[PDB]
Structures are given as structure tokens and as C-alpha cells.
Amino acid sequence: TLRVPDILALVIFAVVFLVGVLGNALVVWVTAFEAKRTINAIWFLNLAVADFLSCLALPILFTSIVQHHHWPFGGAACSILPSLILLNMYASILLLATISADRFLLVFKPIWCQNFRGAGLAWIACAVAWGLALLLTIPSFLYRVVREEYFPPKVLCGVDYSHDKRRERAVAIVRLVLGFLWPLLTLTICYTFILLRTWSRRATRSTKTLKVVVAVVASFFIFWLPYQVTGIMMSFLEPSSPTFLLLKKLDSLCVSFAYINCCINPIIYVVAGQGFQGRLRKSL
């Protein structure tokens, strides 16, 4: 009865679903009303929307893994859904990077930001992030098909790459780079410079910024490294290999460990954000 680490994947998925249905739903409800009166709410509104969509789409892997890889839906759903489920997490990562860049810009240029800063810039940045996520996810809905064999019947979805092998090794490296390396460097550089400038002189030291920065960076790194390394290792090895089986077993656990961040990330905003208790009554 599935003597496999998939049980831990099921438990993690259930817990993350329970904690993610709530949280970034009251968060998005609160941030929706604050629009048209504060520019610091668009970033969190878009991030909460993406996280809530990912959490709501999460309970399909549970049903797909409790059964031994059976596909109830048709070809169109198989070609549509995975792109939409990847777009949300990619947009979340890009939104985090954009928020860090905005914080750095606010810290290092107060006069220019006071003179010229409107909601149009934030909306343009969010649109650019969504467009880049769409460009990242565009190779998904053109190589995914379904196959019906003549063995004891079952239907399963899997990518089909032709004898041209120089295509997988390019798309995999491109997505790995533009989804893990650039945001990490942006976060690290921006937060290190912000901390140095803030602690350079008095009247700005808080001792809370260090905690927030650590809680963001360490969580991001720890919860995103295994998924990327497993994907980049899987995308190269031959299908008929002895090392393929371990990664084939650990893929689901890696995916769950990755999605853990999608339910962790609203807690920081809920806790650190001062006046949240008083803002709930005003929003209602």
C-alpha cells in the first residue's frame, strides 16, 4: 500500500492545504480594500493572489498520487493545467525579487522616491513579472501529450521530447538560471546593502531588520534548493539508468518541500506587519 515516502508527501500536502486556504485569503481581503489609498499594498495583493491560487490548485496532486497515476481528464486539461500551476509559483518568486528591489530603491533614494513615485510604476513592475513568468512557462503547453498503451489500461501524462536531445538541456538550464540564480543574488545584494546603510548611523538601527532578512533568505534557500537540484539532475540522465529510480521516488517529496514555502510566506507579513489586529476591524 504505497510503501514509499509518498505518505510524508500526502501529510505535508494536507497540512499545507489546511494552512494555505486560510491566511492569504484574509490577507488578500485586507489588502484589496487598502488599494487606491496606499502604494505599499499592490505588491502584497499580487503575492497573496498568486499564493492563494497555488494553494487552491494544490489538492489535485493528492488525488493524482493516492491513485497509481491515472488521468481522469482529457488531453486539453493535460495541456492546460500544468502551465497554470507553474505560472503562480514563478510569479511568486519574481514578485519577491521585485519587492526586494523596491525596498532597496526606497532605502537608497528617499528624495527621488518622494518626488516621483506612483502606483503606475508598481503596476508596470507587476505586469513585467507576470509576463516574464508567462515566458518562463511557455514551453510547457507545447510538448505535453498523453499516451494510451495496450497493457492493462491506464492513462498518464508525460512530456515527449523527440530524438533532438539538445532542446531539454537548454530549456532546463534556462529555467534553472532565471528561476533560482538571479532572484537569490538580487535578494542577497539588496538586503546586505540595506542592512549596511541602515546600521551605518544611529536613528535607524532596529535589530528587527536582521531577523526579517534572515527569516526570508534562509527559508527561500533551504526550501528551494532541493527541487531545483533534483530537476536539473533528472533532466539530464538517460531514462534507462539505475540512478533514475531514486529521483523518481523523491520527486513528490521535493515538490511538497518546495510548496511548503507557499504557505510559510504569508505568516511573515501577518506577524511583522504592525496594526494588523486594528486593520481587520477597519477592513470589515
Binding site: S64, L156, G158, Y161, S162, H163, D251, V255
Partner: peptide, 10 residues
């Protein structure tokens, strides 16, 4: 010969 059974989450 083109199939590798990639899980849904990926």
C-alpha cells in the same frame, strides 16, 4: 521512444 512520466507538480 519519447516518454519519461513527469509528475504533475513539475
Amino acid at each position: 521512444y519519447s516518454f519519461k512520466d513527469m509528475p504533475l507538480x513539475r
